[PDB]
């Protein structure tokens, strides 16, 4: 779009390269030299634009997340006071368009958060996921809306699993059980899991 | 156990090193030199004992799996004709003792199976998981044991998720929603998901 300067292109090349050496490839100490070689830029531009490799990665996480979170927020404006079903339906609708986002988030979440090399990326991660309704079944239990013997932690965990796991499972394994995660299948799956959750946990 | 020769110890050091550069660390082309340096052996012993790096990795996968599959088979001898609940209860019982096994399997399953470097490890993977009851809800649908509007693919996917996802989610995230996967919690969770599946999908 438009006629970007070499300078802004270079900046965006670095952020793209960071995103790819995360979605597609290497682990911890990918060097500055390697990111810059993938981007096709002077390695000095990482420190110039971002100060550090860690800030390049956190900046990539925010930029990657911004439109995803905007879409989910827009999708959820329409929906009802905490309804597990609505959260799951809108999650599927948005992650249908951003199929790699859940696996990226889960990968970041698995970093060793005790290591100082990971503090900046971890701070970014928790900011990005701060929208999550991590006690929704606790609230439902307290409003007496769950079956009497339902445990909120267990309900929450199984909800989290049905929502997120489809996007984390390798395509190799979905194919093996006859599934492709098309928009149509995710629409069926939203409908099916809505009913599993209602009949399973609510009354 | 016993007094192993340096020769068998060295062999087992290589298999251990392979297992760790898989559970803990690097991606694709970890070299022979690097595996042997981690093991503390001559790099020539990889080709000597195993022929190739790929056969070292497949051999590690089988050896890692053998006692896990034996335990699950033993646990399931006691159980009833296809019962999703029994599969999930025994899975939790065995993966409680082998908490890293599901994440290892899922990691292997995500390799690019079109690449020739991955054919051997992929063959091993599919052998290890050949026990999985990947059409159990299809069979249940056909025996008329599911609710009328239940889709077998969707049921199977949500079952797979509740069974496996707990072991794949980073501990950072379980802790954030107040969960540690203790034997006691997995026992509660088995009980809870048994009821979610019955009330959710069966009649």
């Amino acid at each position: 779009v438009g006629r970007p300067s070499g300078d802004t292109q270079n900046r965006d090349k670095l952020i793209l390269a960071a995103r790819n050496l995360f979605i597609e490839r290497p682990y911890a100490q990918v060097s500055i030299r390697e990111i810059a070689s993938l981007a096709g830029t002077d390695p000095g531009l990482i420190r110039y634009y971002f100060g550090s490799k860690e800030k390049l990665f956190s900046t990539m996480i925010h930029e990657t997340a911004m439109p995803v979170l905007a879409q989910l927020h827009k999708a959820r404006r329409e929906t009802r006071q905490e309804s597990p079903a609505a959260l799951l339906q809108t999650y599927y609708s948005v992650m249908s368009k951003h199929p790699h986002f859940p696996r990226l988030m889960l990968r970041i979440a698995g970093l060793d958060q005790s290591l100082p090399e990971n503090a900046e990326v971890t701070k970014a991660f928790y900011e990005v996921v701060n929208f999550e309704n991590i006690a929704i079944f606790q609230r439902l239990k307290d409003k007496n809306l769950l079956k009497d013997d339902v445990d909120a932690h267990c309900a929450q965990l199984s909800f989290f699993a049905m929502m997120v796991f489809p996007f984390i499972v390798p395509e190799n394994l979905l194919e093996r059980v006859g599934i492709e995660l098309t928009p149509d299948f995710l629409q069926l799956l939203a409908e099916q899991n809505t009913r599993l959750l209602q009949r399973g946990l609510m009354d």
Side-chain angles (χ1 to χ4, degrees), chain A residues 1-24 26 28 30-46 48-73 75-77 79 82-202:
Chain A
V1 87
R3 278 179 183 284
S5 53
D7 286 347
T8 74
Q9 283 178 74
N10 282 347
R11 193 194 160 274
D12 289 337
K13 280 177 187 179
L14 292 165
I15 295 161
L16 190 64
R19 185 193 281 110
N20 294 332
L21 291 152
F22 239 101
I23 286 179
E24 301 175 353
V30 183
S31 89
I32 278 166
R33 291 174 295 238
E34 294 166 301
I35 298 156
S37 179
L38 190 65
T41 78
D42 183 53
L45 289 180
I46 300 193
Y48 176 81
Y49 289 125
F50 308 99
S52 73
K53 182 172 101 195
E54 293 80 23
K55 178 62 171 176
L56 166 62
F57 295 141
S58 61
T59 305
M60 177 272 294
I61 286 160
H62 289 288
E63 286 190 11
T64 305
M66 175 179 75
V68 179
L69 299 173
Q71 288 157 36
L72 193 55
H73 186 263
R76 285 176 178 174
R77 276 185 189 280
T79 73
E82 245 77 68
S83 166
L87 293 171
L88 176 153
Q89 295 156 13
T90 55
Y91 190 83
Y92 286 7
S93 178
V94 167
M95 303 303 160
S96 190
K97 311 176 297 181
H98 299 284
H100 296 307
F101 187 75
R103 213 184 272 92
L104 175 54
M105 292 303 99
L106 216 67
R107 163 155 203 173
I108 296 160
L111 290 170
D112 180 343
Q113 297 176 358
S114 78
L115 296 177
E117 321 86 80
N118 291 328
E120 210 152 334
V121 160
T122 300
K123 175 181 179 286
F125 171 72
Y126 282 124
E127 282 166 352
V128 158
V129 298
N130 75 9
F131 74 85
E132 294 183 349
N133 292 291
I134 64 174
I136 188 172
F137 286 88
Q138 177 75 352
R139 285 183 284 110
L140 287 171
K141 183 73 177 180
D142 292 334
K143 303 230 193 198
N144 267 292
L145 298 170
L146 299 188
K147 299 178 187 313
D148 182 41
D149 55 10
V150 174
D151 179 86
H153 285 117
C154 294
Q156 186 77 33
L157 181 54
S158 281
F159 170 66
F160 179 27
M162 293 168 10
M163 179 153 61
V164 175
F165 189 64
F167 299 92
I168 299 310
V169 205
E171 281 96 337
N172 298 325
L173 299 182
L174 295 174
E175 279 180 49
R176 171 174 182 248
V177 301
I179 294 166
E180 187 187 359
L181 284 201
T182 63
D184 272 2
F185 177 86
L186 287 168
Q187 172 173 295
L188 179 61
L189 186 62
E191 185 196 338
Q192 296 274 314
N193 281 336
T194 294
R195 299 197 287 245
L196 176 52
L197 292 164
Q198 281 164 358
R199 301 163 172 179
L201 303 164
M202 316 286 208

